[PDB]
């Protein structure tokens, strides 16, 4: 129920199990990654689609068992001055495989001269700060992006959906369902005595 609020979603249509059917199926483990990207790079992350910001950063493959949910929110995400905390990799060594990461504070070369402490014209930095400012356009705005991944058929399932509960009933036989025990019969007060593990 906390997945249908907290600002309108920029992209809630899913590419796998439906987001309305999370209650209907119980999962083993759920994986979430939290980062903010520019508004022009939201279209880059997609099943079977990549560009410059998508290939050199985390990539979402065609098969994911999950999808992406993003929303627009500017409360502590955009700065009127500078925003150097949020950086993107735009000059990488090679393609970045999915479910992998790499961090480097050292300059990235682009030719034959090995730059490992000296810079110049042919050597640049692989990192660059985001242009997150409210004075810019809509596509330059920061967007809170989270991706949900589900792991199935590898472990016992414990992340189950919220199964609702109803009110009491007495002396009138219904089609009850007590923790998976489905049956039909009256509900009367029991004179028996159980044990706490029973």
């Amino acid at each position: 129920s906390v997945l249908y609020n907290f600002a309108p979603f920029f992209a809630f249509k899913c590419y796998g199990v439906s987001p309305t059917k999370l209650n209907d199926l119980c999962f083993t483990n759920v994986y979430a990654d939290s980062f903010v990207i520019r508004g022009n790079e939201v279209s880059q992350i997609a099943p079977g689609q990549t560009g410059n910001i998508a290939d050199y950063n985390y990539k979402l493959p065609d098969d994911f068992t999950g999808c992406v949910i993003a929303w627009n929110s500017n409360k502590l995400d955009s700065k009127v001055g500078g925003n150097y905390n949020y950086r993107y990799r735009l000059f990488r060594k090679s393609n970045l495989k999915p479910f992998e990461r790499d961090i480097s504070t050292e300059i990235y070369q682009a030719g034959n001269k090995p730059c490992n402490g000296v810079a110049g014209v042919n050597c640049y930095f692989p990192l660059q700060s985001y242009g997150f400012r409210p004075t810019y356009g809509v596509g330059h705005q920061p967007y809170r992006v989270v991706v949900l991944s589900f792991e199935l058929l590898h472990a016992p399932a414990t992340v189950c959906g919220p199964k609702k509960s109803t009110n009491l009933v007495k002396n009138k036989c219904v089609n009850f369902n007590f923790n998976g025990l489905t049956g039909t019969g009256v509900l009367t007060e029991s004179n028996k005595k159980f044990l706490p593990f029973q």
Partner: antibody, heavy 126, light 109 residues
Framework: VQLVQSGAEVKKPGASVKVSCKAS????????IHWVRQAPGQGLEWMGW????????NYAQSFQGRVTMTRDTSITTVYMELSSLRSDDTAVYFC????????????????????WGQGALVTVSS | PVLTQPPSASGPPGQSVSISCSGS????????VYWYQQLPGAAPKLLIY???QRPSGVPERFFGSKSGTSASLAISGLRSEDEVDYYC???????????FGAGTKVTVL
């Protein structure tokens, strides 16, 4: 912006002083405040930034307990405490204003001191 | 990894001259190098940021560039009103703090 400095007296070693720079004239949740000390006979020294919305700081390998950096969002005024003043600590504490949040370590490469305002003169003697 | 700057500068007016600001290995080049100045008895300002473009409000006389460990400040013509105290600013990842040069004093010959 109102980057004025509050006056401080000369105190002998064995106590601590308070150096305050006014942070009004701009929003306190988006602009960073940096402090640089200029001492004659050597280069400038730089000890840490502040994040004026929460608790976040980074120290260099020059001072660990002499410099305490605080913040106040209700009054929009930062207060700095310097203890055990000496010839090494005798420097012009400059109040610098820079844009950017920079609560991490890889963001300070892209920062630069936009405006320097009303560097306080601090001295010390018995 | 301390920045190396001469204590005094010998700049003759009428011709160009280059001055150097060098650090050490993994000190200059991995991070951008800035040029800063301060008026005597006044708050400092910035001369050249990132050694790429000249900021607005400053005349285009000082040329900023980096050549490996050595950072060069190229000038074209010397004026009597441009005798501000020059300084070198850089960032190093081995200290997590800004390292500044010794400071170069420009005196007219």
């Amino acid at each position: 912006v109102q980057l004025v400095q509050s006056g401080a007296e000369v105190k002998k070693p064995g106590a601590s002083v308070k150096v305050s720079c006014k942070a009004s004239g701009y929003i306190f949740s988006d602009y960073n405040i940096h402090w640089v000390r200029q001492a004659p006979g050597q280069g400038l020294e730089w000890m840490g930034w502040i994040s004026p919305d929460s608790d976040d700081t980074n120290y260099a390998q020059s001072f660990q307990g002499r410099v305490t950096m605080t913040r106040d969002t209700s009054i929009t005024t930062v207060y700095m405490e310097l203890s055990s003043l000496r010839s090494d600590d005798t420097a012009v504490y400059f109040c610098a204003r820079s844009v950017g949040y920079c609560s991490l370590n890889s963001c300070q490469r892209w920062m630069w001191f936009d405006t320097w305002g009303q560097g306080a003169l601090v001295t010390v003697s018995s | 990894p301390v920045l190396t700057q001469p204590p005094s500068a010998s700049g003759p007016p009428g011709q160009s001259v280059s001055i150097s600001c060098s650090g050490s290995r993994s000190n200059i080049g991995t991070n951008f190098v800035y040029w800063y100045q301060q008026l005597p008895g006044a708050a400092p300002k910035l001369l050249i940021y990132k050694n790429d473009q000249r900021p607005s409000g400053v005349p285009e006389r000082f040329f900023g560039s980096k050549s490996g460990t050595s950072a060069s400040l190229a000038i074209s013509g010397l004026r009597s009103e441009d005798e501000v105290d020059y300084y070198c600013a850089a960032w190093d990842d081995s200290l997590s703090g800004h390292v500044f040069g010794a400071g170069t004093k420009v005196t007219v010959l």
